[PDB]
Scaffold this active site. Sequence first.
Site, mmCIF file in Angstrom:
data_model
loop_
_atom_site.group_PDB
_atom_site.id
_atom_site.type_symbol
_atom_site.label_atom_id
_atom_site.label_comp_id
_atom_site.label_asym_id
_atom_site.label_seq_id
_atom_site.Cartn_x
_atom_site.Cartn_y
_atom_site.Cartn_z
ATOM 1 N N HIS A 1 4.340 1.806 8.884
ATOM 2 C CA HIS A 1 3.756 1.476 10.165
ATOM 3 C C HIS A 1 4.052 0.016 10.415
ATOM 4 O O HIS A 1 3.284 -0.695 11.053
ATOM 5 C CB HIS A 1 2.260 1.772 10.192
ATOM 6 C CG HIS A 1 1.941 3.231 10.082
ATOM 7 N ND1 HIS A 1 1.882 3.889 8.873
ATOM 8 C CD2 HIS A 1 1.687 4.163 11.028
ATOM 9 C CE1 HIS A 1 1.581 5.157 9.079
ATOM 10 N NE2 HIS A 1 1.461 5.350 10.379
HETATM 11 C C1 LIG Z 1 9.239 8.604 5.960
HETATM 12 C C2 LIG Z 1 8.486 8.206 7.204
HETATM 13 C C3 LIG Z 1 7.329 8.891 7.527
HETATM 14 C C4 LIG Z 1 6.581 8.511 8.640
HETATM 15 N N1 LIG Z 1 5.550 9.320 9.095
HETATM 16 C C5 LIG Z 1 4.880 8.957 10.253
HETATM 17 C C6 LIG Z 1 3.915 9.789 10.829
HETATM 18 O O1 LIG Z 1 3.605 10.856 10.315
HETATM 19 N N2 LIG Z 1 3.331 9.446 12.025
HETATM 20 C C7 LIG Z 1 3.611 8.234 12.627
HETATM 21 O O2 LIG Z 1 2.968 7.856 13.602
HETATM 22 N N3 LIG Z 1 4.528 7.394 12.059
HETATM 23 C C8 LIG Z 1 5.220 7.786 10.929
HETATM 24 N N4 LIG Z 1 6.340 7.076 10.577
HETATM 25 C C9 LIG Z 1 6.551 5.744 11.234
HETATM 26 C C10 LIG Z 1 7.191 5.844 12.593
HETATM 27 O O3 LIG Z 1 8.134 6.896 12.578
HETATM 28 C C11 LIG Z 1 7.817 4.507 12.983
HETATM 29 O O4 LIG Z 1 6.804 3.576 13.269
HETATM 30 C C12 LIG Z 1 8.598 4.582 14.271
HETATM 31 O O5 LIG Z 1 9.635 5.566 14.205
HETATM 32 C C13 LIG Z 1 9.121 3.188 14.615
HETATM 33 O O6 LIG Z 1 10.173 3.355 15.526
HETATM 34 P P1 LIG Z 1 11.139 2.164 15.935
HETATM 35 O O7 LIG Z 1 11.774 2.561 17.238
HETATM 36 O O8 LIG Z 1 10.337 0.898 15.911
HETATM 37 O O9 LIG Z 1 12.156 2.007 14.730
HETATM 38 P P2 LIG Z 1 13.167 3.129 14.247
HETATM 39 O O10 LIG Z 1 12.671 4.545 14.521
HETATM 40 O O11 LIG Z 1 13.487 2.933 12.794
HETATM 41 O O12 LIG Z 1 14.441 2.742 15.163
HETATM 42 C C14 LIG Z 1 15.395 1.888 14.553
HETATM 43 C C15 LIG Z 1 16.809 2.458 14.692
HETATM 44 O O13 LIG Z 1 17.815 1.457 14.788
HETATM 45 C C16 LIG Z 1 18.813 1.648 13.776
HETATM 46 N N5 LIG Z 1 19.282 0.343 13.283
HETATM 47 C C17 LIG Z 1 18.667 -0.507 12.414
HETATM 48 N N6 LIG Z 1 19.476 -1.568 12.322
HETATM 49 C C18 LIG Z 1 20.584 -1.447 13.123
HETATM 50 C C19 LIG Z 1 21.733 -2.230 13.422
HETATM 51 N N7 LIG Z 1 22.057 -3.412 12.873
HETATM 52 N N8 LIG Z 1 22.645 -1.741 14.289
HETATM 53 C C20 LIG Z 1 22.472 -0.531 14.869
HETATM 54 N N9 LIG Z 1 21.372 0.224 14.588
HETATM 55 C C21 LIG Z 1 20.449 -0.220 13.721
HETATM 56 C C22 LIG Z 1 18.188 2.478 12.689
HETATM 57 O O14 LIG Z 1 19.215 3.200 12.087
HETATM 58 C C23 LIG Z 1 17.176 3.300 13.494
HETATM 59 O O15 LIG Z 1 17.760 4.454 14.057
HETATM 60 C C24 LIG Z 1 6.992 7.421 9.397
HETATM 61 C C25 LIG Z 1 8.089 6.701 8.991
HETATM 62 C C26 LIG Z 1 8.784 7.024 7.859
HETATM 63 C C27 LIG Z 1 10.135 6.296 7.967
#
Ligand SMILES: Cc1cc2nc3c(=O)[nH]c(=O)nc-3n(C[C@H](O)[C@H](O)[C@H](O)COP(=O)(O)OP(=O)(O)OC[C@H]3O[C@@H](n4cnc5c(N)ncnc54)[C@H](O)[C@@H]3O)c2cc1C
Lengths: 662, 55
Positions: A566
């Site tokens: 998180h």
């Molecule tokens: C194993 C797991 C279980 C979880 N379970 C839950 C749950 O049950 N419920 C819940 O609320 N939350 C859960 N989460 C947390 C939640 O999924 C995350 O908070 C949320 O997806 C955050 O999204 P984001 O858009 O901030 O980042 P992300 O979803 O990680 O988006 C980042 C993206 O950018 C890409 N990226 C990174 N660096 C680069 C770069 N240099 N160039 C190009 N691309 C790049 C990555 O590959 C990724 O696709 C879980 C997370 C994990 C990982």
Amino acid sequence: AIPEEFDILVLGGGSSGSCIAGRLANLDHSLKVGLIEAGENNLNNPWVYLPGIYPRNMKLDSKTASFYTSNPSPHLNGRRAIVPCANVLGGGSSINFMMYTRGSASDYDDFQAEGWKTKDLLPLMKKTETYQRACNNPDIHGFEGPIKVSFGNYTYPVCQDFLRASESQGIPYVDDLEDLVTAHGAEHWLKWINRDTGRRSDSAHAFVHSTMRNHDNLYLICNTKVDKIIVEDGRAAAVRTVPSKPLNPKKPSHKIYRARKQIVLSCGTISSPLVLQRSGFGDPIKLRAAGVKPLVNLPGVGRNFQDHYCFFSPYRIKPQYESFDDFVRGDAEIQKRVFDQWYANGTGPLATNGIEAGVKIRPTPEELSQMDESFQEGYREYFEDKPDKPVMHYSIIAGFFGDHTKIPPGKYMTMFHFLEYPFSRGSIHITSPDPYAAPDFDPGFMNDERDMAPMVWAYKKSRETARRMDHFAGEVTSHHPLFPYSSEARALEMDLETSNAYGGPLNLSAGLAHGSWTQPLKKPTAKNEGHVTSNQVELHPDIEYDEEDDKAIENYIREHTETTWHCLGTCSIGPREGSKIVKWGGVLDHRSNVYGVKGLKVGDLSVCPDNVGCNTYTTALLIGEKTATLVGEDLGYSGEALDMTVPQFKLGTYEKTGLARF
Amino acid sequence: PDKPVMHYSIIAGFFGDHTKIPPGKYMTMFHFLEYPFSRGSIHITSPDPYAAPDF
Ligand SMILES: Cc1cc2nc3c(=O)[nH]c(=O)nc-3n(C[C@H](O)[C@H](O)[C@H](O)COP(=O)(O)OP(=O)(O)OC[C@H]3O[C@@H](n4cnc5c(N)ncnc54)[C@H](O)[C@@H]3O)c2cc1C
Ligand SMILES: [Mg+2]
């Protein structure tokens, strides 16, 4: 087929980035939006859309995760916690445990942004999901959003027990804990599962792959890690990229995409500060260490990292009760039926997230009085002021989320607890110009003294609620805190006859005990006669603690906490000059513009100044649609049709139309 | 000179409760002190043959 110059780039394939990408493509159609992602495409991938194989995604050798490793810390007893990050399109939405929950109304108020108030964000939260559950509070939950939320198509019988057990501990049972106005509660936990199909409800299929079939004006550039964001004349007009995997050492490759009017960082809270720092956004002093030239002075980038502190405590279950533990074990005969039911029907064990029920908590002052004085001091300033905020959460998993190779064979129910608002604050920073180089960073787990008391107290609480469940057979002592051997607080194992029940008829070693590795559990007090047969209960004695039994739980928590993913902070809203909530100073403006540059925006979940006491996925969607709307007004487009509906074939309630139920 | 202080061997398996240990195959070391210095005692508590001695 791919052009060099997109109209609106959207770096990252994160759930928030898929939100921004899908919503943005939709508003004009004519506008050219190109999305760039560092990871594989996930369309129609069986290992993504079907919910019940979530644990596999977390394996160390697993492709879909990055597994960053922290610097060692004394506070974790020299432990080096890994901090995994999603690496597939759709981000963590393709990986997550699919837990659904929503934060307190006070949380969004705590951002104290010029916008971003809960009163304003409520309709936007309402626009992003349909609500398969039998809602009572319909003035808050959306009913026709792209992303679907439900109880799934299977239900382990653990939840009723967990509710009857929690209700006896003075914890009220509330029908909706997502109301946004509650502390104490219990609920049959919701899941991000499309009940009408049994598929996972990730943002990618809901926003990106649903738009691309319908509309030509969207480009997906999977497998291209971002290197840097070129900036000149005050505008961020380019983003050079490198291949995700360096398979050709002699001739390294790169490509420079161009954005005509807007750029957007949705790379997640770990990758994003790194990408800003490679571009020269940070302290010149810290950046000269990596040799990058400092273009803009933003001390706050990479600072104020924040997590939740989950830790798992398995309890053995009776042989006669169901668990997913034998599916993920995994047997070749059970697993075959579990798939076969899902293809045949859509309703099986496979069609459900493991977690079944859970309890947000805010301690009674009477029990708060025994907590360490430091945490009492933190409670007065932080939670005394606000009633809405839970201090800690735990649920129950109908199986063992972990490595089954390393645990004795049997069936287990495992408690899951994660602190709601850890006081501690981390940091992150690039060490090298190279994209591939691993950052050095301190998550800062247990960095602050105040973070321990709620943890210990929740272990003490969850053990008691796992001891009142009908399923309970005995603690698995190897995975519980190392109490002194003679202690009455000790973690007892399963009974002898149950040992025979698991060992099979032919075992030559069931109750054999040498070396006193484990202590057999005593029989439950006899059921009262003269009570109705349905009201009779047989119950284990309550346990009690002393200082030496508290130090053990404390060392346990120090040695076995980890990130709950998180994670948020790093690049975050606040004054450039600095603020009390962000000591190093913020980097974003309230309109999510990065400070000191024109044309760059952040759509990451990193944007949050402070913790949201809920699973982070909902805030991801919400922030993604906030930044989407902000880009919309930034383009000067009218508030009419500013809403950006994705294509979808809406299914009604089954009694409204005959084509929608399981 | 003749007397060993301690002995250990090796068992080609796990001598114990397999219900309580992770699945796999193990080799277990077995060690027993040759001449413990300590001295115990034993005594009947009751006339009854069946009664468990305290010792
Ligand atoms: C194993 C797991 C279980 C979880 N379970 C839950 C749950 O049950 N419920 C819940 O609320 N939350 C859960 N989460 C947390 C939640 O999924 C995350 O908070 C949320 O997806 C955050 O999204 P984001 O858009 O901030 O980042 P992300 O979803 O990680 O988006 C980042 C993206 O950018 C890409 N990226 C990174 N660096 C680069 C770069 N240099 N160039 C190009 N691309 C790049 C990555 O590959 C990724 O696709 C879980 C997370 C994990 C990982
Ligand atoms: Mg993450």
